[PDB]
């Protein structure tokens, strides 16, 4: 409880298959008209959930991948491009490698999650919704 303003600004991408999220270079940053070209850079972080299965043993639900602007969120201190499990990096041409403190993260008590939209022509990877 008590998440504060630590949520992703966007809804998650759900992984229905067995391959990690990835995008072609230059692709994958969610659309956000309240941001500038230098802002268009960040990471998706895999969030796992467990539930009790019908047989009484714990079970994984499908992973969900949440976008955070560079320098914000749970991996705020992680450098762009660092190889870290559960983290994948995306940037649009025109991005700058600077932390996006001015955008930050979302307080769900004050703002709903922006439906995650990618520009027309983005390669959406297999098994992702």
């Amino acid at each position, epitope marked *: 409880s008590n998440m504060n303003n630590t949520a992703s600004w966007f809804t998650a991408l759900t992984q229905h298959g067995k391959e990690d999220l990835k995008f072609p270079r230059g692709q994958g940053v969610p659309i956000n008209t309240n941001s500038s*070209p230098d802002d268009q850079i960040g990471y998706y972080r895999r969030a796992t959930r467990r539930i009790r299965g019908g047989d009484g043993k714990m079970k994984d639900l499908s992973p969900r991948w949440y976008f955070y602007y560079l*320098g914000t969120g749970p991996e705020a201190g992680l*450098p*762009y*491009g660092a190889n870290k499990d559960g983290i994948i990096w995306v940037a649009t041409e025109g991005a*700058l*490698n600077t932390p996006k403190d001015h955008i930050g993260t979302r307080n769900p008590a004050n703002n709903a999650a922006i439906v995650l939209q990618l520009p027309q022509g983005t390669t959406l990877p297999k098994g992702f919704y």
Partner: antibody
Amino acid sequence: QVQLQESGPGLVKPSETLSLTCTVSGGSISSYYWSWIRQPPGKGLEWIGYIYYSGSTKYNPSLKSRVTISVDTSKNQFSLKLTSVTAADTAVYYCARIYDSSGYYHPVFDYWGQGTLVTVSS
Amino acid sequence: EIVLTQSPGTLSLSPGERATLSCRASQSVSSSYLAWYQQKPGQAPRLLIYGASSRATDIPDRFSGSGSGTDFTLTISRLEPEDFAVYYCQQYGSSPWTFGQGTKVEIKR
């Protein structure tokens, strides 16, 4: 090879407007960020602002009320306008390109002009 | 703004010595938002290190950057007379981008 060159008056009266132009040769303005940085005589460096080739800008908040950076792709130039100058604005003004050849988007100044001194004086 | 304080203000060392330059920030700039520039008299600055610890490609590996948060170091091994310069750190972890006031490295003879 990419070369930058500042031009403009070396002497400006107090309260008037300082204007400089950077001319780029051996490469295009297009696709890059461009920046102005200044250095008062005997002192350190101060970042003024940048402009992306397609027009978006970001300025140092302490100068924002007085600064305009503009870009002219047709002439392969970008420019600086600084209003209401005082002796605190006397400095060598550098233009620079921002570009990270490693592909990791770092805002590093990879090519610089030679600098042009502007003295604010009556 | 984030203020960068460089220490010492001047350094005087013999060729072949190892030089240690300090840059300390007033607020954290994480681990990849710091650059170092070298400035010789009459010249524009020149990129040495970026991303706190990544070295520019035309710079030899006797230059190295380290640190994180607020505490950063530039190390120059095998100092040379041509290493006389003012060395500036610069942060881009916060707007506005800001420079330290420099450490001038004098070569002893």
